[PDB]
Amino acid sequence: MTEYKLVVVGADGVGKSALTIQLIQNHFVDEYDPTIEDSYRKQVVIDGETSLLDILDTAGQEEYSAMRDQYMRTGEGFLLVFAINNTKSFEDIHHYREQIKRVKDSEDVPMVLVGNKSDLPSRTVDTKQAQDLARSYGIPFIETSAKTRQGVDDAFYTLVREIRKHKEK
Ligand SMILES: C#Cc1c(F)ccc2cccc(-c3ncc4c(N5C[C@H]6CC[C@@H](C5)N6)nc(OCC56CCCN5CCC6)nc4c3F)c12
Ligand SMILES: Nc1nc2c(ncn2[C@@H]2O[C@H](COP(=O)(O)OP(=O)(O)O)[C@@H](O)[C@H]2O)c(=O)[nH]1
Ligand SMILES: [Mg+2]
Numbered sequence: 001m002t003e004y005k006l007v008v009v010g011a012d013g014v015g016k017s018a019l020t021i022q023l024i025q026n027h028f029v030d031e032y033d034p035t036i037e038d039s040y041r042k043q044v045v046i047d048g049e050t051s052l053l054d055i056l057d058t059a060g061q062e063e064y065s066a067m068r069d070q071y072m073r074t075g076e077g078f079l080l081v082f083a084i085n086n087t088k089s090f091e092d093i094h095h096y097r098e099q100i101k102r103v104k105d106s107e108d109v110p111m112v113l114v115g116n117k118s119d120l121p122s123r124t125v126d127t128k129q130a131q132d133l134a135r136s137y138g139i140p141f142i143e144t145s146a147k148t149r150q151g152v153d154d155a156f157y158t159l160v161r162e163i164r165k166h167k168e169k
Pocket of ligand 3: 016017018032033034035036057058059
């Protein structure tokens with residue numbers, strides 16, 4: 001039985017809270033307070049190992065206190081979430097990835113790129129763009145919908161697998 005500190009990051013409105021609540025509660029919450037940063041545990045067996053996932057759903061004002069750096073540094077893996085209907089959210093991925101690298105003092109931090117809202121037709125970010133970005137970062141890319149649950153388990157479980165591989169490097 002292993003505990004993992006997972007962190008869900010990305011722009012406002014991409015679906016970080018909806019993704020987190022899908023994983024923990026198996027339903028789509030269409031109104032989660034956009035300002036509230038909170039954490040939740042999900043206990044699940046992944047490839048045979050009981051796993052305690054402690055998931056930080058980030059939110060709130062953009063601030064860079066030394067305390068926030070130290071706290072983010074304890075994250076073991078990060079979901080880099082953008083929404084496929086929001087180009088700005090995709091462009092902001094670089095910032096979140098660099099802040100993770102900045103506080104972890106490492107070029108090899110477990111991360112997964114997540115293209116959320118894949119149920120919507122109003123796509124402005126191409127799947128190929130996202131694949132090219134994830135390839136350039138050396139990380140997996142997973143398409144999700146918090147609305148339908150498409151890809152949600154895959155995104156979190158792939159992140160756990162990336163942490164396990166990191167531990168063995
Ligand atoms: C997350 C995280 C985070 C890490 F993953 C790792 C280490 C970190 C260390 C220190 C701090 C953070 C961190 N905390 C909050 C951030 C944030 N807010 C404001 C909005 C957007 C998401 C949510 C929180 N509510 N916003 C932006 O950036 C928004 C934009 C993008 C370009 C700069 N900035 C200008 C306006 C748009 N960055 C953030 C940020 F880095 C860390
Ligand atoms: N259609 C669709 N809407 C979504 C999805 N994920 C989130 N939303 C909606 O997008 C809005 C922002 O989601 P939220 O989880 O609050 O994003 P956060 O700011 O990143 O926590 C809400 O109206 C959600 O219901 C999704 O996968 N599909
Ligand atoms: Mg939220």
